[PDB]
C-alpha cells in the first residue's frame, strides 16, 4: 500500500507473511539505499537484534500470522518504504513482500489528485514508421504516489508501455512541488486506426482517507482513480 | 562422558513467574547470566567481567527460540503438565561458626520441579529483608533444578534462623531451623 | 491443585578432554528430553516419540547440521581457552579449622578446586577408624566445603590441595 500522514499522527503498518513461515522481518529502505533491518519476530516473540530506531517505533506479532509496526509521533524523517520478508524457519531464505511506502507531510493541504489527459498520435508518425504512440500526462499531483496503467479494450496492457521511472516537478526548487508523470503506448498503425479499439490511461492516486481531516473547500484529495480515454481514428 | 571440565549453556522458559533464565555454568558453577528485563549480562564474580564480555543479545535470542518451542510443544504434548517434585532443603554455614564474627548462612534447595518457589529468611520469627542474596535456578542432570539462598548474619546463642521454602509439591511450607 | 504451568528447557554442553571438545545440545520439555545433537554422531537424534518430526526436519537441512557441527571449535574450544585463566586455573586457598563440637571435626572452607583430601593424625599416627567425611559441599559461590569426623579417645588435621604447594596442618 501507500500511506500519507500529517506530522505527529500515529501510524501502524500491516504485513501478512506467507503461511507456515515462523520468521518475520521488518526492513526499511530510504532513497533507494540499502534496506535497513528493524525487528525480527520468531512466532509470538521478538528475537530482534533491535534495529528499531526510537522509542516511537514498536512492533507486535500476536499469533505469528501477521505483524504490525507502530510509529507514534511521525516525523518527516520516518518517511520511507517499509519492507517485510518472511522465512519458513530461522535461517531459511527470506522472501520480501511489496511493502508499504510511508510519507510524513508537514500538512495535508499540499496533497492534490492528478489531472489525466490522453493525446492521440501524430499522423506523420503513422505515415512514416507505420506505428502510433499514445502519450498520457498525469499532471498536478502531490505526493508522488501514482500507478499509471494502460487499458486496451478493457484489458491492462504492459507491452509497448513506457512508464516514466520518477515524476518531475512543476516548481523544481520547491520541495513540496506537484509532481507530473508521462507514459507512452506504441501500437501498430493498423491497431490505432481500428475505430473499434479502445485505449485508456488509468492513474491510481494514493492520498488522504476518510479518517484524515479536511478543512478546506476544494475536493478532498482521497485515494482516487483519474483516467482518460481515446478511441481509434480511421484514415 | 570422559570430561576434565564441562561447560554448559542452560536456559529454560515456562509459564509462571520465572518466565526465563539464560545462564552459563562451568563445572556446575554459574559464571554469567543475562537479565532479560535489563537486557544486560550479569557476571557472577567481578573478576569474570573484567576479563570477558558476553553479548546479551545472544541470551535474548535463545529465550525467544525456546518460547516458540514451548508453545509448539504445549499443543504437541496435548497440554501435559509434569508432576511436581518436592524439594530437599539443607541449611549450613559458609564458615565455621564463631560468635561475634560475621558469617553467611546458606539455604540449599535441591531436586525440585517446576522452578517456581517462594523462599524467605526468618530470624527469630521475623522476615529479613536486608543481607539476603539468592542464586538463580541452577540446572541439574535429571533436569530438575536447585537454588541457593544466602543470609549474612552475626552468630548469637539467642538468635535462631529458619529457611521458609514454599513449593507446589510440598503439602505444607517447609521450614529448616538452624541455630548456633 | 497445582496451577497450570508448562516448561521448556535446553542444554548446550561442551565436554573437554585431551584437547577434544564434544558438543551436546539437548531439547527438553517438562523434564522430558525429546531431542539431542551429538557431535560424535554428527546429526540430530530423537530421544522419544515427541521429537521425531523435529529431528527429521533438522537433519533434512544441511545448514542446520553444519552450524551445529562447527560448534565444537567455534564455541566449545574458543570458550574453553578464553575462560581458562579464570576457570581452569581458578585457585583458592582453603582455610582449615578443627573443633571438638567424643568426635573431632576438621572443617575445610573456601577452596575452589573441588578435589581435596584430608587425613587425621593422632600423635603422628594416621587413623582410619571412626573417620567419616561429608561429601563435597558446593556453596554455590565457586567455593567448596567439606567436614571430616573422627571417633577420638581423649588423653592434627593435614590437608592436601592443588592451590597449596605445601600441605597445611592445624593442631
Amino acid at each position: 500500500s501507500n500511506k500519507v500522514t500529517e506530522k505527529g499522527k500515529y501510524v501502524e503498518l500491516r504485513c501478512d507473511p506467507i503461511s507456515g513461515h515462523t520468521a518475520l522481518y521488518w526492513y526499511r529502505q530510504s532513497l533507494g539505499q540499502g534496506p535497513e533491518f528493524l525487528i525480527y519476530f520468531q512466532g509470538t516473540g521478538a528475537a530482534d537484534d533491535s534495529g528499531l530506531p526510537n522509542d516511537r517505533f514498536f512492533a507486535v506479532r500476536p499469533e505469528g500470522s501477521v505483524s504490525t509496526l507502530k510509529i507514534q509521533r511521525t516525523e518527516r524523517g520516518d518517511s520511507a518504504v517499509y519492507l517485510c520478508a518472511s522465512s519458513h524457519r530461522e535461517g531459511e531464505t527470506q522472501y520480501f513482500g511489496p511493502g508499504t511506502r510511508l510519507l510524513v507531510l508537514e500538512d495535508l493541504n499540499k496533497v492534490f489528485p492528478p489531472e489525466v489527459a490522453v493525446f492521440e498520435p501524430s499522423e506523420a508518425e503513422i505515415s512514416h514508421t507505420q506505428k502510433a504512440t499514445l502519450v498520457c500526462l498525469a499532471t498536478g499531483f502531490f505526493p508522488d504516489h501514482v500507478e499509471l496503467s494502460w487499458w486496451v479494450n478493457g484489458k491492462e496492457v504492459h507491452s509497448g508501455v513506457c512508464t516514466d521511472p520518477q515524476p518531475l516537478k512543476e516548481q523544481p526548487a520547491l520541495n513540496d512541488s506537484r509532481y507530473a508523470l508521462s507514459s507512452r503506448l506504441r501500437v501498430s498503425a493498423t491497431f490505432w486506426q481500428n475505430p473499434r479499439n479502445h485505449f485508456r490511461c488509468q492513474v491510481q492516486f494514493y492520498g488522504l482517507s476518510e479518517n484524515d481531516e479536511w478543512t478546506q473547500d476544494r475536493a478532498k484529495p482521497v485515494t482516487q482513480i483519474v483516467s482518460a480515454e481515446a478511441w481509434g481514428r480511421a484514415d | 562422558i570422559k570430561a576434565d571440565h564441562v561447560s554448559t549453556y542452560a536456559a529454560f522458559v515456562q509459564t509462571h513467574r520465572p518466565t526465563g533464565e539464560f545462564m552459563f555454568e562451568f563445572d556446575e558453577d554459574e559464571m554469567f547470566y543475562v537479565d532479560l528485563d535489563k537486557k544486560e549480562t550479569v557476571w557472577h564474580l567481578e573478576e569474570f567481567g573484567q576479563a570477558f564480555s558476553f553479548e546479551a543479545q545472544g541470551g535474548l535470542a535463545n529465550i525467544a527460540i525456546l518460547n516458540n518451542n514451548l508453545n509448539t510443544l504445549i499443543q504437541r504434548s496435548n497440554h501435559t503438565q509434569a508432576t511436581n517434585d518436592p524439594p530437599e532443603v539443607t541449611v549450613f554455614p559458609k564458615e565455621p561458626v564463631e560468635l561475634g564474627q560475621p558469617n553467611t548462612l546458606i539455604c540449599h534447595i535441591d531436586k525440585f520441579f517446576p522452578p517456581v518457589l517462594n523462599v524467605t529468611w526468618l530470624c527469630n520469627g521475623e522476615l529479613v529483608t536486608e543481607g539476603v542474596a539468592e542464586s538463580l535456578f541452577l540446572p541439574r542432570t535429571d533436569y530438575s533444578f536447585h537454588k541457593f539462598h544466602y543470609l549474612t548474619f552475626v552468630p548469637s546463642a539467642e538468635d535462631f534462623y529458619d529457611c521458609r521454602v514454599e513449593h507446589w509439591g510440598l503439602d505444607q511450607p517447609l521450614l529448616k531451623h538452624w541455630e548456633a | 491443585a497445582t496451577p497450570e504451568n508448562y516448561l521448556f528447557q535446553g542444554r548446550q554442553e561442551c565436554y573437554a578432554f585431551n584437547g577434544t571438545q564434544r558438543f551436546l545440545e539437548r531439547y527438553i520439555y517438562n523434564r522430558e528430553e525429546f531431542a539431542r545433537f551429538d557431535s560424535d554422531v554428527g546429526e540430530f537424534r530423537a530421544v522419544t516419540e515427541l521429537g521425531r518430526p523435529a529431528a527429521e526436519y533438522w537433519n533434512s537441512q544441511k545448514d542446520i547440521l553444519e552450524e551445529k557441527r562447527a560448534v565444537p571449535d567455534r564455541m566449545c574450544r574458543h570458550n574453553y581457552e578464553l575462560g581458562g585463566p579464570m576457570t581452569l586455573q581458578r585457585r583458592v586457598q582453603p582455610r582449615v579449622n578443627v573443633s571438638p563440637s567424643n568426635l573431632l571435626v576438621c572443617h575445610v572452607t573456601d577452596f575452589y578446586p573441588g578435589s581435596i583430601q584430608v587425613r587425621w593424625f593422632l600423635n603422628g599416627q594416621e587413623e582410619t577408624a571412626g573417620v567419616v567425611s561429608t561429601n563435597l559441599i558446593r556453596n554455590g559461590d565457586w567455593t567448596f566445603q567439606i567436614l571430616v569426623m573422627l571417633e577420638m579417645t581423649p588423653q592434627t588435621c593435614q590437608v592436601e590441595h592443588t592451590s597449596l604447594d605445601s600441605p597445611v596442618t592445624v593442631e
Binding site: - | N68 | A54, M75, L82
Partner: peptide
C-alpha cells in the same frame, strides 16, 4: 576477541 561465543537453539518443526 575477549567475548565468549553462543549458538542459536533451533525451532521445533511446527
Amino acid at each position: 576477541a575477549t567475548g565468549l561465543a553462543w549458538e542459536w537453539w533451533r525451532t521445533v518443526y511446527e
